[PDB]
Subunit: 149 residues, 3 copies
């Protein structure tokens, strides 16, 4: 009778775990997650970069960062407007790094990797046409978070 | 007479430097360091991840991190029980990084790189069988430090 | 008359932008910047590493770091004396990392990558002959900053 309940409750807990796993899978699917690929989500709210970082962190994802043409288009389609990307040149001007670390392996600048020569535009936004431009991290742009494949 | 002592004391200092260098070499050998390879050491104490990091840092090493099968086995043999590895997904859930930076180049997960979907298991322990599993950084596991080749 | 001034002032602002762009280009040229390559600059002042980092950061550059023989020689020629490089082993003894992150891809040590075994020499200086040696970050050496290609 003692271990009986513990057994029923343990199995009970397992069924809840299974239900939640499905809920998460279906949610991701509904959010447009492509099989075996990272996906992007937005609440369409515009805010300063620091807030975007905090929000994506709270959701256990990270600020969206395109690493190839496919992802650049995907983020573009989700944002629908100017949105911050997870890259900055806050530390070394003209040398953008992912917020999670490292030099860019892919980019889509309007021209070349931008050195602002002192004006302080250290964040990056992707515009309606998919191109990237440096901008002030204090400006308010659309928050787009990414989640793992 | 003036430079005479300075000369004798300087040479004296050099002999001590040489003795200590040998002491360090012999110690490493006794600790199981393989020729030209990094080595792992433990005091068999179990503690939270933050404490393991602080301790390995104090010893001027770092938390053990396997980068290939050989090292995974080596750490396993030294720990003899569950031990923390120098990798976490504290920052980006499901995307483990070395505490010293960078994405994993080698792993030995029970299944796939674990996304805890919110339960907060952001550290990693290697178990008796060599497999890796995410776990709470607050849990107490064996402290294993690594030193350079 | 209303938009007339705004137009003249906007164009006015554009001419100033163009003038400043040329000033910056000519300055870089005069500072010895080679076509399409990063360049190094110094004020010949000797100071602790923390101050060098702060100063290069204020100039929106970063502490000089040679990534190949060419750059090693270039920095050497600019410094003319012992100077700090943008690399340290403050975190993991014997494993030097760029201050901007990552393991070394090029080095020119007097011998091998130095493990100080506890004496705390965690910074790096390039000497008159181009060779590298670990040294105390508290010592005062020549400040050399680098700017992007
Ligand atoms: Ho920037
Ligand atoms: Ho995690
Ligand atoms: Ho060091």
């Amino acid at each position: 009778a003692i271990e009986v309940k513990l057994a029923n409750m343990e199995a009970e807990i397992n069924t809840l775990k299974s239900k939640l796993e499905l809920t998460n899978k279906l949610h991701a699917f509904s959010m447009g997650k492509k099989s075996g690929k990272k996906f992007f989500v937005t609440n369409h709210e515009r805010m300063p970069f620091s807030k975007v970082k905090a929000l994506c962190s709270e959701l256990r994802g990270t600020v969206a960062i395109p690493r190839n043409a496919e992802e650049n288009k995907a983020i573009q389609e989700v944002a629908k407007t100017s949105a911050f990307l997870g890259i900055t040149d806050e530390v070394t001007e003209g040398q953008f790094m992912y917020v999670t670390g490292g030099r860019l392996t892919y980019s889509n600048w309007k021209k070349d990797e931008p050195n602002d020569h002192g004006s302080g535009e250290d964040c990056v936004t992707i515009v309606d046409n998919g191109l990237w431009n440096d901008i002030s991290c204090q400006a308010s742009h659309t928050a787009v978070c990414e989640f793992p494949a």
